[PDB]
Design a protein around this ligand. Structure first.
Ligand code: CL
Lengths: 202, 197, 199
């Protein structure tokens, strides 16, 4: 169930969600599946922040991606109440307090723990791990492990040289057949071996 | 849909939930309120000021300690079993007091408000905050347990807002100063209010 | 219904969940929705073991299935082994067991706490609402936050040693009835003397 889930690309119909190959969601049997993860994302506008998810990601049950930016609430105005979005004739002069946050971008090979919450506009680099229940309020670096609320640095998965090797080779770009030829290396800690294998194919 | 939605006043049936005008929930709202008995007038109530914005999946914890006494041998509420063997159990329930959310409060998505907490006017509760203690007027808090982040305005601006209490004005009066309401010009709104008195 | 909820022993069918008497869940979607990723058809997986007289708040989560096949130390965390893809046939199984999750007796789990895999929580512990318990919790310890951290102990070390001797959760409901005035009190020393006289 958490090992396989169901692939996200089949579950979504919102054009503002873009997801790469093989990425899956393990909360598939709850509610409406992956769609329930995605909060406040307008499907009928092309001028809103989108949710971009790389290939080969694993999203844990109940993860939340917060979209719609500041939801019309301006902390710096007298009131956070979104007057502009009330159908009230008295409030017709209200100014739009909506502020976009930018796209939410999740890299390739990202593992998002169960019930983590990703705040608007955050970028999570390739290979990162988001602990269960983390509240990610800032960008996460490639291969970084973070947790807590607000999420904070725990560690990196690999050495800086291994990270550079992974950033050069971009194994998620290879075909499944090419990944199948080097599956013994993919399922190992031998980053150096996989880098050498990739160079010999170039 | 987080910009508006169903106003809370129209979608509650629990007499122990009292909510001011225009406050809305972007999720219904009854599912936010945990363990609140709708048939008893001797329990902690949930009081919500006007012009509040409540994010999806926020939780307001009611029913106090739920009968669990951390100072007793066991936290198991023997008193609340129908078991004849426990007939002499002592009631462990301890009320927390009303939960009181002020006017113009923004409660982030999936924040949890613990029992008996007061959240002052104009406060902002970050998404996923766990609010275990009172929050001051115009204070921003986050994390678990929630901690101080910042104040939205200076002490003198807060005092101006506490004197003018714009949420008490009619929607018609608010429309007349809407350019100011949608600005950081708190002194301008204050001078505007004084000219109307 | 936070005060008595409904008993867990009667609302479970997953044989990998083992729960003591009187323990109840106050979000009755029932208690089984609290248990995440637990395979009910295998006997070689981590089990969920819950003592008697526990109180589990609404929406608590018990994370099972260990690392769910994700090896942080491998090139990728993507569980190639669990994809039915013919190209990934030589994939190695990344699953690592965490060990059983063990909740002691007389444990209060706050609403929407999450218990990570392999964790042991001692008798008498209190888990604050929304705590994320990433490591073992000691008997009669109170923890909270994310990750959970020590707050206090409910009783002194001498009182805790007394409670670990007498193990009142082992007594019958009838015996507990005979000392209910002491059970509903802070008089640990009094309950210990009562127990000594009953032996
Ligand atoms: Cl948290």
């Amino acid at each position: 169930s958490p090992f396989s889930g169901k692939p996200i690309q089949e579950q979504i119909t919102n054009p503002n969600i873009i997801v790469g190959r093989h990425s899956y969601y393990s909360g598939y049997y709850h509610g409406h599946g992956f769609d329930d993860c995605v909060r406040y994302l307008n499907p009928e506008r092309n001028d809103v922040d989108k949710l971009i998810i790389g290939s080969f990601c694993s999203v844990g049950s109940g993860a939340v991606f917060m979209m719609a930016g500041n939801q019309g609430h301006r902390t710096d105005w007298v009131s956070t109440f979104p007057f502009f979005y009330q159908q009230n004739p008295n409030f017709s002069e209200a100014k739009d307090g909506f502020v976009r946050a930018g796209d939410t971008r999740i890299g390739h090979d990202v593992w998002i723990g169960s019930e983590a919450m990703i705040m608007p506009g955050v970028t999570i680099g390739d290979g990162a791990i988001i602990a269960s229940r983390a509240v990610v309020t800032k960008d996460v670096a490639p291969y970084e492990v973070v947790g807590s609320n607000p999420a904070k640095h725990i560690k990196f998965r690999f050495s800086p040289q291994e990270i550079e090797m992974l950033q050069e080779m971009q194994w998620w770009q290879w075909s499944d057949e090419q990944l199948g030829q080097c599956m013994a290396l993919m399922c190992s800690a031998d980053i150096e071996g996989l880098y050498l294998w990739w160079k010999q194919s170039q």
